[PDB]
Structure formats: structure tokens, C-alpha cells
Amino acid sequence: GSPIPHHDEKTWNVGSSNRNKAENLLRGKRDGTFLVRESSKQGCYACSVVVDGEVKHCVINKTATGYGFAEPYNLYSSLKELVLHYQHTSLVQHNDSLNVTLAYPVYAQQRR
């Protein structure tokens, strides 16, 4: 019985307008950190995740259909589900230099 902090969308949701900022926040966290922000996209998102210590920006969705991490599957109108899947799934299946996952909430919230 453990109440994960990911259950909340604010734990990692930084909103929009935080590219070098959300990246400046990741610079220091531990490998596996991740944050979901937005941008001038048409409504897509970008999850700034720390990989091997070097934070990078990735995309979560591309075409209006859901919030997967690269491929459109199932539905769900929220990222909390996507982030939850990759939260335990490796992200190397696409890159052998990734092997990262959303295991650490960029802003976390295990305090108050």
C-alpha cells in the first residue's frame, strides 16, 4: 500500500513555457527524472527526461488521438496514464542511448 506521487498530474506537469527552465530543473535530478511541458506546438507536449545524467526534451503525442509517448494507442484524454505506463516501461526500445523512464517526478511531492 504505497501512495505514489505520480497519481497527481501536478507532480510532473509544469504546464507550458519551460524549455530551458524545465531543463534547468532536471539538471541535477537523478537519472529517470521526467517533466511534461508544452510549447508552440499545435497542442502536443514534450517530456523533458534526464537520461544518463544529460537531460533532453522528448515528445509525448503528435496527432490528436491521445497522449501516448510516440504511437497513438487506446484513448484517454490525460497524460497521467501515458507517464504511468512508461513510468515502469523502458524508453530504450526506440533508442539504445535512452533506457530511461518516468520513475522520478521532476517536481515530486513527498513532502507537503
Binding site: 515528445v59 509517448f69 524508453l91 526500445q93 526506440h94 533508442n95 535512452l98
Partner: peptide, 5 residues
């Protein structure tokens, strides 16, 4: 922007 699976 890195491509994921």
C-alpha cells in the same frame, strides 16, 4: 526532441 516507442 527524442523519439520514444
Amino acid at each position: 526532441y527524442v523519439p520514444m516507442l
